[PDB]
Amino acid sequence: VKDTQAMKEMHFHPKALKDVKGQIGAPMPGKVIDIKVVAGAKVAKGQPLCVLSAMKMETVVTSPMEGTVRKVHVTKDMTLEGDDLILEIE
C-alpha cells in the first residue's frame, strides 16, 4: 500500500551541475561573508567576487570566465553548502 502520509520534505538548495561551466559552485560549505557583484554586472577573469567563512577557514570565490552575471542566487549571510548554485556568469 502506497502511503499518503509520506509528506515528502522540500529543501530548495539549488544544486550546481558540473557539466555547465557558467554555473558556480561553492568549493567549501560555510557562510558567505560578502558578495562583490550585483545582478546584471560585469565580471573579469581571475577576479574575486565572493568570500566564504567557516569555523576556522576562509575562502574567496574567483570568477571562472568573462562576461556578465544574470542573477545572484545567494543574497547575503546564509548557510551555503558546497557545489550549489550561487551565481551565473555570461
Binding site: 569555523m55 576562509e58 570565490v61 570566465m65
Partner: protein
C-alpha cells in the same frame, strides 16, 4: 548580579545545551579525581632560585654541569593537543598545583602556556590566558616555567609587527614568565634571529629548537642530510642562545638517527645543554629516547603515565623504571608518579566528549608515509568533522601526502601543516586528484591561506616550491620578497586602548589590550558574552559539562565565603512564546528564572 548571571547561564545550559561544538556525543562520568595529600610546608628549592640569584648564564651552566638527567613534564600543554583537542578547563588544573610545587622539585621547567592554549582560551575556552598564568604563578614558587613562542609572528598565524612582538615578549616576561621558546615554521634565519633578540630583550633564558624532518640515517635521503642540520646549528649557535633544542612533532627519531645526531651535535658543543622534544607515535619512542640519553642527552621531554603514548610523549614510568641500575640515574621516586597518574586517569574521563582514541584506538604505524604532526592529527579530525568530512577521515589524510608532494618535501609544524591540511581538505572535498589539480590550478579557486603562503608572507622555504604552480595560482598578484616583517608596517596599539574603552572597556589592562590587538573579533566575542552570562571558569568542569539534571545541589565558589549552593528544584514548560521557567534554590533562597 553575578550569581543571577551564573544561574541564568546554568539554566540555559540545562534547557538548550553546551555552546561549544561537541565532537563525540559522550556523557562525562561522575568520578571525582582524587587530590593527593600534600605537605604543609613551603615548596622546596628547585632551579628557580638559582636563576633568581644569577643571570641566564648561571642557570645555563647549572644545567650543563649537573650529573643526571633532566625531566620535561608535558602533562599540561603537549598532552592536550596530543590526545584531546586542547580542550581542558583550568578549574581542575589547579588541583595538583600544591602537589607539583611541593613534591616535584627535581623537575626542570614546566610547559604552562602555548599558542594553541591562547587561541582556544580566546575562541572556545571562556578564560583569559594572562589570568591563567597569573593565578598559576603563586601556586608553584619552585620551578621555572617554559612557554612555546615563535620567531616572526608571536601568537597569531600570520606575521606581525616587530614592536608588537617586543611588547608581548616584555609583558609576558614581566608577568613572571621564566623561559622563552622560539622557533619558525621554515628554516628562515632572520625570523629565528628576531625571536632570539626578542627573548633576550625581555631578559632571560633563550632556548633554540630546530625541526627535524626525514631520515638523517638513510643514505637516500638527500634534501635533509646531517650537514644541512650541522650548518644550520652553527648559524643558530653563532646567533646567540643558552640551550639548544630539537623539534620532532612526528617523532621520526630512530635509535640510530638518535645516536648519530646527538654525537655529531655534542661533538663540538660540549658546553650547551641539549633539549629534546618528541612524540611517541611510532610506538618506539622510548628506546630512541634511551639511546639519546645514553649518548649525550641533557633535557628529555617525558609525559605523564595516563596521557602518554598513542600520539603523546613517553610515560614517566617506563623512563624511570628502565634507568635503575645505570649511571644515568634519573633519581626520581615513582610512588608519587603512581598517584599523579591515578589523578590524571580519573580526570581524563571527564573530557570524554572529545577523545581521539575513539578514532585513534591503536599505535598507528605507517606514519612515515603520512608524516602527520602529532599535535595536529586530532585538530584536523575535528575540523574535518565540522566541515562534514569526518566520515571520510581516512580519505582526508590520504590526501595530505599528495598535497605535501605538490608543494614539495618541506618542514611542517604550525603554519606549515595547517595549510597543507587545508590543501588535503580541499582535495577530498572536491574529490579530485593531484596531477590534474596541478593542471587546472589557474581557474580552480583555491583557499586564501594557500594563496598567502605562496605570496611568501610566512617566508622562503629551504628547498623552494614549483614555479608553474605558483605562476598559475599567484597569477597577477603583488608578491612580498625577503622578510616581510622588515618591510611590514608596524602597527600602533595605543589607540586600541581608547577604542576598547569607548566601546566596551572600563578596566581594560595592557594585557587585555595585547589580546585584543592580537585576536580582536574573538576577543569581542569573549568579552561581550562573558558580560551577559557572567564570570565563567569559576564552576566545576564536570558540572557544566553535563549539567543534565534537576534536583542536583551543587556549590559554585565564585568568591570565597559565597558557596552559592544551587538546587535545580523543577523545570516548567512553555508559557506563551517559547520561553520556559526553571526553579532554583540558592544557599537559602528560591529563585524563579526565565
Amino acid at each position: 548580579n553575578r550569581a543571577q548571571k551564573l544561574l541564568h547561564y546554568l539554566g540555559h545550559v540545562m534547557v538548550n545545551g553546551p555552546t561549544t561544538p561537541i565532537p563525540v556525543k559522550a556523557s562525562p562520568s561522575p568520578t571525582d579525581p582524587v587530590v593527593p595529600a600534600v605537605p604543609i610546608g613551603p615548596p622546596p628549592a628547585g632551579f628557580r632560585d638559582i636563576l633568581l640569584r644569577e643571570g641566564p648564564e648561571g642557570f645555563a651552566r647549572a644545567v650543563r654541569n649537573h650529573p643526571g638527567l633532566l625531566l620535561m613534564d608535558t602533562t599540561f600543554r603537549d598532552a592536550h593537543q596530543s590526545l584531546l583537542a586542547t580542550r581542558v578547563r583550568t578549574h581542575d588544573l589547579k588541583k595538583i598545583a600544591p602537589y607539583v610545587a611541593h613534591n616535584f622539585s627535581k623537575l626542570f621547567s614546566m610547559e604552562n602556556w602555548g599558542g594553541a592554549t591562547f587561541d582556544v582560551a580566546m575562541r572556545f575556552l571562556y578564560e583569559c590566558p594572562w589570568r591563567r598564568l597569573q593565578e598559576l604563578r603563586e601556586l608553584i614558587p619552585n620551578i621555572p616555567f617554559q612557554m612555546l613562542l615563535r620567531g616572526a609572528n608571536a601568537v597569531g598565524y600570520t606575521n606581525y609587527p616587530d614592536n608588537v612582538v617586543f611588547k608581548f615578549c616584555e609583558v609576558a616576561k614581566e608577568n613572571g614568565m621564566d623561559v622563552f621558546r622560539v622557533f619558525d615554521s621554515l628554516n628562515y634565519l632572520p625570523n629565528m634571529l628576531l625571536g632570539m633578540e626578542a627573548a633576550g630583550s625581555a631578559g632571560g633564558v633563550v632556548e633554540a629548537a630546530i625541526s627535524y624532518t626525514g631520515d638523517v640515517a638513510d643514505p637516500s635521503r638527500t634534501k635533509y642530510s646531517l650537514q644541512y642540520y650541522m650548518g644550520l646549528a652553527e648559524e643558530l649557535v653563532r646567533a646567540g642562545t643558552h640551550i639548544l633544542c630539537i623539534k620532532d612533532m612526528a617523532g621520526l627519531l630512530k635509535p640510530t638517527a638518535c645516536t648519530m645526531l646527538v654525537s655529531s651535535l655534542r661533538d663540538r658543543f660540549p658546553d650547551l645543554p641539549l633539549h629534546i622534544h618528541t612524540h611517541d607515535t611510532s610506538g618506539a619512542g622510548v628506546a630512541a629516547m634511551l639511546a639519546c640519553a645514553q649518548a649525550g642527552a641533557d633535557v628529555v621531554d617525558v609525559a605523564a603515565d595516563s596521557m602518554s603514548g598513542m600520539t603523546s610523549q613517553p610515560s614517566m614510568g617506563a623512563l624511570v623504571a628502565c634507568t635503575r641500575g645505570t649511571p644515568l640515574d634519573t633519581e626520581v621516586p615513582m610512588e608519587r608518579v603512581f598517584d599523579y597518574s591515578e589523578y590524571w586517569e580519573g580526570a581524563r574521563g571527564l573530557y570524554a566528549a572529545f577523545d581521539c582514541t575513539a578514532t585513534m584506538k591503536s599505535g598507528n604505524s605507517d606514519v612515515y608515509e603520512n608524516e602527520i604532526p602529532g599535535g595536529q592529527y586530532t585538530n584536523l579530525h575535528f575540523q574535518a568533522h565540522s566541515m562534514g568530512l569526518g566520515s571520510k577521515f581516512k580519505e582526508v589524510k590520504k590526501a595530505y601526502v599528495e598535497a605535501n608532494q605538490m608543494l614539495g618535501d618541506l618542514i611542517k609544524v604550525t603554519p606549515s601543516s595547517k595549510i597543507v591540511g587545508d590543501l588535503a581538505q580541499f582535495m577530498v572535498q572536491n574529490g579530485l586528484s593531484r596531477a590534474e589539480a596541478e593542471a587546472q590550478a589557474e581557474e580552480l579557486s583555491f583557499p586564501r591561506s594557500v594563496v598567502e603562503f605562496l605570496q611568501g608572507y610566512i617566508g622562503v622555504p629551504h628547498g623552494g616550491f614549483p614555479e608553474p604552480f605558483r605562476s598559475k595560482v599567484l597569477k597577477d598578484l603583488p608578491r612580498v620578497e625577503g622578510r616581510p616583517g622588515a618591510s611590514l608596517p608596524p602597527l600602533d596599539l595605543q589607540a586600541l586602548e581608547k577604542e576598547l574603552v569607548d566601546r566596551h572597556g572600563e578596566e581594560v589592562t595592557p594585557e587585555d589590550v595585547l589580546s585584543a590587538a592580537m585576536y580582536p573579533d574573538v576577543f569581542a566575542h569573549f568579552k561581550d558574552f562573558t558580560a551577559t552570562f557572567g564570570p565563567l571558569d569559576s564552576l566545576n568542569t564536570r558540572l557544566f559539562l553535563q549539567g543534565p539534571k534537576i534536583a542536583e545541589e551543587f556549590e559554585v565558589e565564585l568568591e570565597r565565603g559565597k558557596t552559592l549552593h544551587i538546587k535545580a528544584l523543577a523545570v516548567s514548560d512553555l508559557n506563551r512564546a517559547g520561553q520556559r521557567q526553571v526553579f532554583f534554590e540558592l544557599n537559602g533562597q528560591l529563585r524563579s528564572i526565565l
